[PDB]
Paper text:
The sixth gene of the tdc operon encodes a protein, TdcF, that is a member of the YjgF/YER057c/UK114 family. The location of this gene within the tdc operon is strongly suggestive of a role in the degradation of 2-ketobutyrate. The most significant structural features are the three symmetry-related solvent-accessible clefts, located at the interfaces between pair of subunits, close to the "equator" of the trimer.
As with the serine ligand, the carboxylate moiety of 2-ketobutyrate makes a bi-dentate salt-bridge to the side-chain of Arg-105, whilst the keto group forms two hydrogen bonds, one with the amino group of Cys-107, and the other with the carboxyl group of Glu-120. However, in order to provide a hydrogen for the latter interaction, the ligand would need to bind in the less stable enol form. A comparison of the four TdcF structures presented here shows that the largest changes occur between the 1.6 Å resolution structures of the as-isolated and the 2-ketobutyrate-bound forms. A further modification was apparent at Lys-58 in just the A chain of the 2-ketobutyrate-bound structure. This was modelled as a carboxylated lysine in two alternative conformations.
Author numbering:
A (entry chain A), B (entry chain B), C (entry chain C): 2 to 128
């Protein structure tokens, strides 16, 4: 067990760490669209989706991995009518990094911490 | 890592793959009750529960594993009033395969892709 | 692929086992605040949070692991108004065991089994 800590993803606002590196596998906390430098949450769902994904990227990178090493994500969201937009941002994010798409679950929950539109957790493997 | 692809479960409805095989462990994407031959969703919750499980099965089998290798599932549902009925179908499914019940979490979310009544993700192990 | 069974966590309310020990990793089922001795659910959310965490601990300890070996939790809750209270209980729980906080996801769902206010699942690692 090694704790992952990076200033490139928002600091924990609760009793959790950003990531844990087990050697073979890295787990992230659920990443919300909070900007790591300012603490702000962007209003637009496209911008939230991108920021949540960049926050996941920051943690995986801090472990010595990259987006292509992510093998499973869960995307908790507040509105499935956002699905198409979120998916386009998500596809572009992986495509940008020449990364195979991970396995995924996506469900619409009632509400999320800080009233964000999505929260994304990831599991990555060290090859 | 190796992508799992099978015609015996539905194709991806977003930027994800059906399953990933890490050697020691297989992850599936969350499986919804879409019939792979018709692209349609049965109305009855018993039929949906069984079909989501068959979709999970197809992916685990494509990886060279069996129902008995599944060790964790998460069952997202839209109505806990369906819990007892879902549980009966789920219990029978594992019983038919002479398989130990996996660990599980079951929660009622607000909404699921294509307005299905449940979505199930699985983790299986090889050795 | 050892099943974990302990009297210090409630018996299963559906077709699942309390925990599975894979050797390298232990998974628990989602634990709800049901008292393993009495079957009763405490009314106050501070008490529900402590009890769900004790139920998780019971399974992790039954496998021969410690609170400090927990590396990921997911906390499903029904009311974000309860979040600060849950976080305080959760923080104090890890602090009492001198355990660094695991990675975490937290989401507000619509409803949980037995109408409890939270459900917590855990993953722990050996060595």
């Amino acid at each position: 067990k090694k704790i992952i800590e990076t200033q490139r993803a928002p600091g924990a606002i609760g009793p959790y760490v950003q990531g844990v590196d087990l050697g073979s596998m890295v787990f992230t906390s659920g990443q919300i669209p909070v900007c790591p430098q300012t603490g702000e949450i962007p209003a637009d769902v496209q911008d939230q989706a991108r920021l949540s994904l960049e926050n996941v990227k920051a943690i995986v990178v801090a472990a010595g991995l990259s987006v292509g090493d992510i093998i499973k994500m869960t995307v908790f969201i507040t509105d499935l009518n956002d699905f198409a937009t979120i998916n386009e941002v998500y596809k572009q994010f992986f495509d940008e990094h020449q990364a195979t798409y991970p396995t995924r679950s996506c469900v619409q929950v009632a509400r999320l911490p800080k009233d964000v539109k999505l929260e994304i957790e990831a599991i990555a493997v060290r090859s």
